[model samples]
Target chain A: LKCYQHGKVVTCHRDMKFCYHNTGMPFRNLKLILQGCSSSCSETENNKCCSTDRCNK
Target chain B: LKCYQHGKVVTCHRDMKFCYHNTGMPFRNLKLILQGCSSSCSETENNKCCSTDRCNK
Candidate 1:
């Protein structure tokens, strides 16, 4: 499978089950823009979860 | 025990049960250690948390 890791394409691991996009930070100024193959995450909750190649994009 | 910090050495609060170290950026260029005490927090992939005093180092 494949995914968008930090907005760039990447080949994912065989054990990866989902593609996820999580944007969070400890506070302000700095940012967290994460998109990658993930082992797990909720489908319809706080952090976004998707399936299929490059689905996180 | 004592936790490490950038500018100061201070005691943690009595109620604080954990010490955390969080890296702020996704890109390889930036690396920072944001550390302090916490009452309780979920230890995710980006955040390293520990139960012992001075464990944040």
Candidate 2:
């Protein structure tokens, strides 16, 4: 499963992996990094990014 | 209540207040401060802080 969240800071559970799926396809084989965007939000004006696999809206 | 977190840049809501209680009693009626600690994390080693009312252990 995929998930997305934003708080004071969002971090992984250490056992889970944050994978990036293509816009059209849904798969985890093509990972961009071991962890993508693990630290937290950088922009206060807008703290959201689209993820086809996790968050689509 | 109290809360703590870390990230690329952790911040808080405009209405929420991040207080630094003198480590003993917690009484929000003291008019301690309007708000505090509304920024994200800076350090990479850890992402947690102690709080008496919101978070502990």
Candidate 3:
């Protein structure tokens, strides 16, 4: 919600496939993954969803 | 809307050039752009097209 599109921020089961509902995952996890990725796209995807509920309003 | 942003998830015009207007392009295509591109960006009239809509949603 802060200036980041930090996706669902769900508690991924360390496998990524298993996702936590209700509470969002931490931006830090995304930031960690972003450290390796090129464009931080997964972050962008997460942000798109977050924006629908936040920025779009 | 599950755990993924899943982009427009709508029926594209097939030709790609023809926009569907409602449904959007697949996330896979964008994902590839995101994957392959070191800087997967271009402009239409100088506006950044990608962030405006999907994330804008």
Candidate 4:
């Protein structure tokens, strides 16, 4: 699983989401995306999960 | 001038002191010393000047 933060929006996805999980995706850029989540978050919907482990909340 | 911090010891010195100002010195290692000062410090003595600009004080 991976967690990404774009602006204030935080999204987490499973490996099945190729567009989100693609290894070569530009999402790997720290300046473009905040990736890697270590825990679960309360907001789980729209095919995305959140982990507050590293979030501001 | 340069300011260095090793453990609780913070020292600064002029360029004349080769042992302290030597570019090849291992003091460049951040793990070994806290180098660089942007301002003056109150603990200026013993061939060293302190700049609180970057120090804890």
Candidate 5:
């Protein structure tokens, strides 16, 4: 899987888990990161960067 | 509602209709624009700009 943070894309393991925010939520893999992330969008214009991910929730 | 394109926000009437793409999809006002636009995302990184809008589809 891959993490699209900012303009960068990070290749990550599909079976691994990572801390995505100060909230302490552990996202399981990159797709989960895509489905559960929100904080990343705050760094962009109108949170548009996280528009396709879970940031809208 | 508002149409967000390339960091610019366009305030639109709720009852109005607009063409969001060359395909001729008439999005009804800003909410529809938010729910139906696709071309706008093509101008952004990873299509992140339209992440919260319908551009993901």
Candidate 6:
């Protein structure tokens, strides 16, 4: 899988379960983080995972 | 839908609304690049949907 790392794309390993993206903080100061994880993803309002190349893109 | 299967072109079922693609790799080695069809968006993780001429690309 591939996901955004600090606003850039990074290739992941099979051990990495998913590609993830999420936002946090106030609307006036939203923070974005994209990642390739080695664990199961738990989805929340703005946090999501997709198991594909650059799914967070 | 029309998509690419293992780098070759293919057409999916009529009922399928999504052209699907993904990966399952470990480390920096990109072991797999997937392409196919999806009737629904929930079959697996990192799922995606798109419709157009060869939209799976």
Spell out the clash pairs found in candidate 2. Answer: B2-B54, B9-B40, B10-B39, B10-B40, B10-B41
Write model 2 residue lDDT over A1-57, tens digit each, in one string: 344442222343332233221232235553222223321222332334333335412
The per-residue C-alpha lDDT of model 2 at residue A52 equals 33
- Residue B8, model 1, lDDT: 57
Across B1-57, the per-residue lDDT of candidate 3 in tens digits comes to 111133533332323222111122334232211111111133343222232223313
lDDT of 4 by residue, A1-57 (tens): 233433333343453221121122221111222234333322332233333333332
Q: What is the C-alpha RMSD of each candidate to the true structure, in Å?
A: 10.1, 16.2, 16.2, 14.2, 14.9, 15.2
Q: Write the per-residue lDDT of candidate 1 for residues A1-57, one digit (tens) a residue.
A: 788887588877888877877765644446667678777664344357777888787
Please say which candidate is ahead in DockQ: 1 or 2.
Answer: 1
RMSD of 6: 15.2
What are the Cα lDDT values of the candidates? 0.65, 0.31, 0.25, 0.30, 0.31, 0.56
The DockQ figures for the candidates are 0.11, 0.03, 0.02, 0.01, 0.01, 0.02
lDDT of 3 by residue, A8-53 (tens): 3323223222121122323212211221111223543554332211
lDDT for predicted candidate 1 compared with the true structure: 0.65
What is the docking quality class of candidate 2?
Answer: incorrect
> Model 6 - which docking category?
incorrect
True contacts kept of each: 0.10, 0.00, 0.00, 0.00, 0.00, 0.00
Off by over 4 Å in 5: A1-57, B17-19, B23-57
Candidate 2 wrong stretches, greater than 4 Å: A1-39, A42-48, A54-57, B1-10, B13-48, B51-57
lDDT of 6 by residue, B6-52 (tens): 45666777887776665544533123445666676543664444666
How much is the lDDT of residue A22 in candidate 3?
22
The model with the greatest TM-score is: 1
What TM-score is obtained for chain B in each of the predicted models?
Answer: 0.58, 0.20, 0.16, 0.20, 0.24, 0.60
Taking all chains together, each candidate's TM-score versus the true structure is 0.47, 0.19, 0.15, 0.21, 0.17, 0.38
lDDT of 5 by residue, B1-57 (tens): 344432344543554333132221132111112222333335333323433332323
TM-score of chain A of each: 0.73, 0.20, 0.14, 0.20, 0.24, 0.59
Off by over 4 Å in 4: A5-35, A40-57, B5-35, B40-57
Best by lDDT: 1
Q: Which pairs of residues have clashing backbones in candidate 6?
A: A13-B25, A13-B26, A13-B27, A14-B25, A14-B26, A50-B46, A51-B46
Name the 10 consecutive residues with the lowest summed lDDT in model 3 chain B. Answer: B31-40
Compose the digit string of candidate 1's lDDT tens values, residues B18-52.
Answer: 67666665433335667777655455533566766
